[PDB]
RNA sequence: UAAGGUGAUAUGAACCGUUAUAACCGGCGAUUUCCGAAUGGGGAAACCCAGUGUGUUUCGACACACUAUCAUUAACUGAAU
RNA sequence: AGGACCGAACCGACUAAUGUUGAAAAAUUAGCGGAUGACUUGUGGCUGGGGGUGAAAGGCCAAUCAAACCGGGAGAUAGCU
RNA sequence: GCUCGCCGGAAGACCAAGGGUUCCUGUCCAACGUUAAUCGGGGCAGGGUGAGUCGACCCCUAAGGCGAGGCCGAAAGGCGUAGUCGAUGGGAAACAGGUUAAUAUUCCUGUACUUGGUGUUACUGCGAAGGGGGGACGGAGAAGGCUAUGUUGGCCGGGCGACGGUUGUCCCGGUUUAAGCGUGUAGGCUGGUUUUCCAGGCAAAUCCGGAAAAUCAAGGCUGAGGCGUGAUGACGAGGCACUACGGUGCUGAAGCAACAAAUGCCCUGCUUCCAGGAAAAGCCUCUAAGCAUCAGGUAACAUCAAAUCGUACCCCAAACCGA
């Protein structure tokens, strides 16, 4: 494939966040802490080869962390990168493990 | 099995070792059954040999 | 009447108080004697 | 060094070990994100943006790597003359 | 047009009552003055302590001002309690 | 749940500032509520604000800041040229239904749109970090036209009345409907066009500026609303079935005219005044090299790309400033 990029670890991390099951009505979609930068293309094709499930679209965006934490005061942010990424119906979860 | 072991595969294959060994961290350690009684943690203590393997593929860089 | 306060965050910074400290030898002195001397949690900017 | 062992507040789960590469201790290493002299440029610290090279490349890309400022020397360029 | 009128918003504070361990470390209620102007207001910037700013009261400079706040000289000195 | 009373230029609704989950659901009642509390802005859980079109990034610059070299100054350091940052201002594009316990111009459906690369086709001078235009800007005042929108009638549906009269002159309700597309109107502004000549625009330029001539006029930009289309669609009072009691599926009449308005729109206008009222980019245009059968330019469509952050949750007040 033109899987020469960074397929290799794009997605990573759920999220069982509130909006988990809540977000759930003609196709489960998703979240994962996707690296800081995994673009939606290479996040659509990461979900193909693995957890073999059929991805109809992409999102994601940024969160920043913040907090003040130190030997006196200072502390900072953290930043990640959510991704919601629809997948389908007519395919479940399957044989898997949910968590 | 693990451990120092096949330390000059060149024609390794660390790929996976990871998630296909997940079985405790991804489902066992959810509650219960990450080995209860017969053989529960294993991770630190043996498992943990993920950076052995990591650390040679990172070794035989200069290949 | 007015009683001499008046707040606004954003100017609670270069012009007093905030990260400001980080740019004066006494500025950066006074974290030290504060936070070291009698660790403070300190709160400073918000 | 060794019969135990997976640091602590809590077990528990799932386990690794008993002979000699399981722990655990000491030496030399490998790795070591982002910020911070912070040094590619900027910036309300842990964020933002670029140039020039790279490999795998389903061969747009990913990240990577270098690029601060001064001083000494080296060579090359070089104004009004 | 106007040191013009009443006049809402907006800006200000002349009077009285209440409050005075308050609803409130200056306000509430009823009246009151200005209301296209030396007007009024948002955002950001600049003036630093014997220094600033001041249509001037020693007024204002973070509930502090005949010399701010913080740390230091410092256990100042106290023929006084 | 039925009465009763209070506010209604608000004691209603929306947003900014500020706040920072106070939002919704379930729960529990120690502390907090000036009492009780099964209740809450309280506790503990969950849920709740998924983007090429909204915003920030990002181009552009204001005040102001910083500032290579530079000018000063016992040191620290001050000032400032190029230049670089800095919104509170200018630059490109999406709507209407639906749906979640909590998201929503982000998800789904229906119908669109912007820009860049690549490609095919066609026609062509490009073609700049450059020149010109343009963006592009004050205060105050005076209208006209128009729309929002309201009123009355007509139309359609509905009822004839706990007490005297109202069973057609009457009472109640509805009468709505967008971008986009065609139409270039009330108005607003400004002479076109051609040719040749040049000490101007850092070089060039057909462009802009200047000069002459020559021929006509009835032009050329701008522009609210209206009218067609969108839409024999939707929505629509109301009925009919089902209800968990909140609400649901189906069906569905009329849907026009007249008058009356604005502080909204034409109006970045018109008039007038003195205190004489950002900038840069996009945009249009002109050429340089420099290019020189090329690349590029314009248009049509085909396709790929549009990254990354934010999005959860009162506001004249019990969420902000007043303990
Ligand atoms: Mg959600
Ligand atoms: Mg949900
Ligand atoms: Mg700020
Ligand atoms: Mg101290
Ligand atoms: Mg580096
Ligand atoms: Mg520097
Ligand atoms: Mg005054
Ligand atoms: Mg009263
Ligand atoms: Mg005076
Ligand atoms: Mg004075
Ligand atoms: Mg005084
Ligand atoms: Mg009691
Ligand atoms: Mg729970
Ligand atoms: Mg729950
Ligand atoms: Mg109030």
Same mark, same amino acid.
């Given at each position: 494939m033109i899987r020469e990029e960074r397929l290799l670890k794009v997605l990573r991390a759920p999220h069982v966040s509130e909006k988990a099951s809540t977000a759930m009505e003609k196709s489960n979609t998703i979240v994962l /802490?996707?690296? /800081?930068?995994?673009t939606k293309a290479e996040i659509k094709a990461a979900v193909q080869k693995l957890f073999e499930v059929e991805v109809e679209v992409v999102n994601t965006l940024v969160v920043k962390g913040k907090v003040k934490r130190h030997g006196q005061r200072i502390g900072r942010r953290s930043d990640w990168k959510k991704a919601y990424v629809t997948l389908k119906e007519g395919?479940?979860?399957?044989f898997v493990g949910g968590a | 099995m693990k451990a120092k072991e096949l330390r000059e595969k060149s024609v390794e294959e660390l790929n996976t070792e990871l998630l296909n060994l997940? %079985?405790?961290?991804?489902?066992? %350690?959810? +509650?219960?059954?990450?080995? +209860?009684?017969?053989?529960?943690?294993?991770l630190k203590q043996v498992r943990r040999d993920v950076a052995r393997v990591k650390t040679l593929l990172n070794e035989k860089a200069g290949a | 009447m007015k009683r001499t306060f008046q707040p606004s965050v954003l100017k609670?910074?270069?012009?007093?108080?905030?990260? =400001?400290?980080? =740019?004066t030898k006494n500025g950066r002195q006074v974290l030290a004697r504060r936070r070291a001397k009698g660790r403070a949690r300190l709160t400073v900017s918000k």
């Open positions: /802490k996707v690296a /800081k930068d995994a395919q479940n979860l399957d | 997940l %079985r405790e961290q991804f489902n066992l %350690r959810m +509650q219960a059954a990450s080995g +209860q009684l017969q053989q529960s943690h294993l | 609670r910074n270069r012009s007093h108080g905030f990260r =400001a400290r980080m =740019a």
